[PDB]
Design a protein around this ligand. Sequence first.
Ligand SMILES: NC(=O)C1=CN([C@@H]2O[C@H](COP(=O)(O)OP(=O)(O)OC[C@H]3O[C@@H](n4cnc5c(N)ncnc54)[C@H](OP(=O)(O)O)[C@@H]3O)[C@@H](O)[C@H]2O)C=CC1
Ligand code: SF4
Lengths: 112, 52, 340, 83, 208, 156, 318, 52
Amino acid sequence: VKPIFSRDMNEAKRRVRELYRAWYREVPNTVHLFQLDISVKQGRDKVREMFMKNAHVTDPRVVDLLVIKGKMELEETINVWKQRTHIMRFFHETEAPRPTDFLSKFYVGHDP
Amino acid sequence: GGAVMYPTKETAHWKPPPWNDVDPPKDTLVSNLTLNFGPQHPAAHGVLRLVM
Amino acid sequence: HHALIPHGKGGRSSVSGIVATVFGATGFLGRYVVNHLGRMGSQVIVPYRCEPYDTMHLRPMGDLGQIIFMEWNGKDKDSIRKVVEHSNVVINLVGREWETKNFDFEDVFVKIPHAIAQVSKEAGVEKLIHISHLNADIKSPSRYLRSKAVGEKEVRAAFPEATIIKPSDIFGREDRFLNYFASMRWFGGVPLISLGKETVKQPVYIVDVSKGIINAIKDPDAKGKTFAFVGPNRYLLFDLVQYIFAVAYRPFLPYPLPHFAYRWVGRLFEVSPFEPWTTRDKVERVHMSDMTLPHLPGLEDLGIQATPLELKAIEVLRRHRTYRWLTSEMEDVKPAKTVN
Amino acid sequence: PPLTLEAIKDRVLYVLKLYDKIDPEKLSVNSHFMKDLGLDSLDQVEIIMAMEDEFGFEIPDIDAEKLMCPQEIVDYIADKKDV
Amino acid sequence: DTRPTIRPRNDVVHKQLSAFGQYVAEILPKYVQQVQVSCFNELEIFIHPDGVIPVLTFLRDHTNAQFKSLADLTAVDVPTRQNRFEIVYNLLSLRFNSRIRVKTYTDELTPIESSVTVYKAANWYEREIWDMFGVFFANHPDLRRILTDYGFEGHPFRKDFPLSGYVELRYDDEVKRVVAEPVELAQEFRKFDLNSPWEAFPAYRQPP
Amino acid sequence: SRGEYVVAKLDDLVNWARRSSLWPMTFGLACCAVEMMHMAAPRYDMDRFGVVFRASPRQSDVMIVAGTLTNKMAPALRKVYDQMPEPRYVVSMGSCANGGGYYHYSYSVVRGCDRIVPVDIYVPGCPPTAEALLYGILQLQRKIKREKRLRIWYRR
Amino acid sequence: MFMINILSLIIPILLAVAFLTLVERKVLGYMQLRKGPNVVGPYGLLQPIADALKLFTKEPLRPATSSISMFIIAPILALSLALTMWVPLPMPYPLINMNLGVLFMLAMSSLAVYSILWSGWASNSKYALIGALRAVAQTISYEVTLAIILLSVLLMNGSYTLSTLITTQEHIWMIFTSWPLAMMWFISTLAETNRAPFDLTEGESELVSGFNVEYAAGPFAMFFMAEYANIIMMNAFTAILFLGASHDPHTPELYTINFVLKTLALTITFLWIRASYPRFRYDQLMHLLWKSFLPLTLALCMWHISLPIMTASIPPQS
Amino acid sequence: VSDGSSRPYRCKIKAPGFAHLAGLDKMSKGHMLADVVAIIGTQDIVFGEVDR
Ligand SMILES: NC(=O)C1=CN([C@@H]2O[C@H](COP(=O)(O)OP(=O)(O)OC[C@H]3O[C@@H](n4cnc5c(N)ncnc54)[C@H](OP(=O)(O)O)[C@@H]3O)[C@@H](O)[C@H]2O)C=CC1
Ligand code: SF4
């Protein structure tokens, strides 16, 4: 199939690393500009966590699309198009912890 | 040649002036003002965020 | 009799069966207790003696019909009856740090608690959550802590199976502890008895206290237990205030003020018919070191791990900074020395 | 003051020490990042960014992929600085 | 038929559109796959997805096709096809007072050449197609969210995207900000099964 | 007592000033904003009651949410509300701002501005007529007239 | 007794400003097929009191990014100077009789500008900074023309004493002698007070609220009062300068009434202009004031210098 | 777009103001802030149709 930006996973992994460097070097500015009440480590760990969620992906086309969406998210953060509400949406705080144990799920509700 | 006839360690780092005395222009480009002509603005019809 | 089966996913439109009457919900802790109750889908009943305007901020905390506002009178048991009649949980947060014209520490920390506890038994309320103060002593130097101890015994007499919570010094965005010290900059220096070297405080975050109350209701074993909500670190008064003036980027000028002079200053600020900036009991309570009660369960027993003050102090004191130090992060200021 | 290989090695090792995930027991000039220190690709990228901050030059990812050992980092820095 | 209830049919425009469709198909056989003229005199040309720029540039610049105005640019999600997304171009020819349609197809991954170089109006239309459906347009000057929220995840106009979405907003007093939470509805959207069990139009009967 | 009488009279004076000089902010989101303009039109003339449309939120007393409150718009509406100096009031105009209206089951619509800001008056309609919005504002003036803020302070 | 005179010149001016707000609202309404404030009090006469009580019972907010000292000093300077520019006005007798009251008025106006500047600068907002820069540009455009026109029209007065203006116009209004200067002075006064077709410092439809966008409750009320007091004072200056009034030394009330009526007419024309024209662009304002007025002001200054000499009509020095 | 049922399969709406607002930057080149206010008004933009 026709590629999007890369023809090999190695080429696709290169763009992921480039995005990570841009994201990693942006977190100190994001905390400073948005006046976040978190630490630089928390944001950088959060960036790592979101990258690690899409770690099982093997199709280079999907990898390119994820980086394309990754750059779009970074542009909003750099340009302060996002707000403190948008930035802190990754750090789910109002959401109560949902246990993943069967017995805990059994006690709560009919959730399969 | 050089900046001074008897250069020292501090002065040796300093290069001679340009041949036409035209110093290379600096790249300290002036940043604009990203005013937010946002939704609340009366001329923005209430639901227009104009990032100018 | 009023037993409800929880339904949903614990969200805003869910059903939790935690129909509650939060007395004094129009206050620092009240807001968070109501918000935690509201987000789970609980029928929160909010009695209020203030103007409905002051209760407006509680309205978005719950879904449609999940936040009912109805007036109550602390000196009228009948008004208490109609607000706890259909509640399976009653939480008492009514408490003023200053004696008023018509209400004295005895009337707010003894009479009202007893009335709430007594009436709740009559209506058949299952669980009651009373909020005392860690340093509640029957012979305490402060009348505030004095009445806080008398009322604690009366609640257990009126309501034998009632959970009693003794928070240390709750700190938060609308707090009168962290903001209290940060607001002393307007008076020049920072008057501290013995320069704050003879007082140890263990403040608690507002969110942790609120989640402890909610977990106490959810916990089936909290009935009759006496909890003590404290923070994870103990600070000297001087070290704590210096850290408060550190993240606030204010010039810290501490001068030792003798106890009699500080009490005299406190008396002067009691003249204000509005909310006093400080009180004689406020001075004594601040100078009084926090008690340690290892024989009582805390936040840890309820599953909530206490949040260190260092992590949640930037939120409170950011508004107290000038334009120069608004965007500074929360990591530049080093944590104060803890006496642990 | 001119730059020396020993100074570059010392600065690189100090930066590696500053990295939390790197255990000092296995930390050596010859120890591979992933094979010995137990690091990921993203950890290597963070290390490269830290080295860029320490020495004040830009490392393209082409070279960063090559860099896998502290001695390799020292060699790259020396070549870029002509030391 | 005739009489006031029926809509009159104009054969002249039908013949003209059919002739012009044959003309376009002859000129561009490399990309044109199918040509149709609907009974209400609307011409559709079906183009292989690689023919976006060539066919549109021809329809814009050709002396016998001056479709210099991009009326619309939309996508249709048919999840029953390999290429579910169907990109539709609506053109207007002020010189000949007629309109034409160009239809291509694309997957959830295969990109489409951006027609910004052909029509400058295609910019925001392609941005909206990307935002709503997920179709990526290569060589696009600025592709980003145009209609959804800034931190929105998912493409809503897809047929498999739920009507109410997955997340909802509200103001929390604890965090002093608007927070996104999983969607919970006080009343569920009552889905209605309205299709009649009897065939309505015999002229569109598909083979068994 | 004389104390209550003075406080009650002072409370009436304070309430009368606030309710008779309501200054809504120029904040309109959708179809309902057009009918809001017709309340300021000569036929109904909101300025006749002292209701004057100021622009900056800091110089306003009422926020009339007139239109759909989308998710992208919700943080902007809250911040603009928070920047209003107290006492501030919110009037929800139209079914879109009340409970989502026509777009209640939409992925990008907040189901009523009540989830973002506390609302004092709900004006029903799609769009509510210029009298209906005027009725709601006049109802808000009556609600302010029943505000015993000082009278409660004397009994605190 | 002098303190009583100070109070009798300040408090009535503040009441006049308060009721001028209502007058403006009602005039705009009736020129827009509307009715001004008509519910609060009979014919809306109690609206200003309600507005003042609301503003002074409204919570004032101190911006986090704002420099507090300047943010508070600006409103005070604006009102104090607005109340001070009435001290030398001859109605018919001035409270403070200066030989150079006119230059005092010019200096007081020049200082008042800094209120808008500091309020804008200290507000620490982009819109406020834009408003302050627009005020700077506005004062750049009108000040020279204002001073030149004032000098030219005072060349027939003989001195900068304001009281002498009554005598000079004892037989004829000075507008019959300098009506082009009268038109240009009227437009310059419109531009100076940040008023009709020149409301660029505030810019309701373009800058939300301009320099005072971050001001609320009391300080905003003080800026509004200062603005309207400057409006009335400048219209009074226009009245005394061109629309002279008869003064019977034994019945000063005659002048006072005539003066008041002329000032009221000029303020009503200010509102009339406010509800009749679109707003300028401050680039166009500066271009107008520098390329259509200033050349003409210079030409008329030459003319009014040469005229008394060429006609042997030089006014007396004393 | 009709699939033969009683509910439309797809209903794309072409807003006249959607294309006009896309060219706002093109039209507002070399103009001041006050001119953009004029340019927004002259395009006759209602954001209900723009943001379908
Ligand atoms: N750090 C702390 O604040 C600590 C507090 N506590 C205690 O725990 C509780 C926490 O409440 P807190 O957040 O401090 O509350 P606030 O001091 O912020 O507000 C007091 C609340 O109690 C109500 N109230 C007070 N007195 C009366 C009265 N006489 N009649 C009716 N209602 C009354 C108020 O209603 P209204 O506003 O209408 O008057 C309001 O809801 C209090 O009992 C407090 O003493 C214990 C340990 C630490
Ligand atoms: S309530 Fe109706 S008229 Fe008002 S904004 Fe919503 S859809 Fe438009």
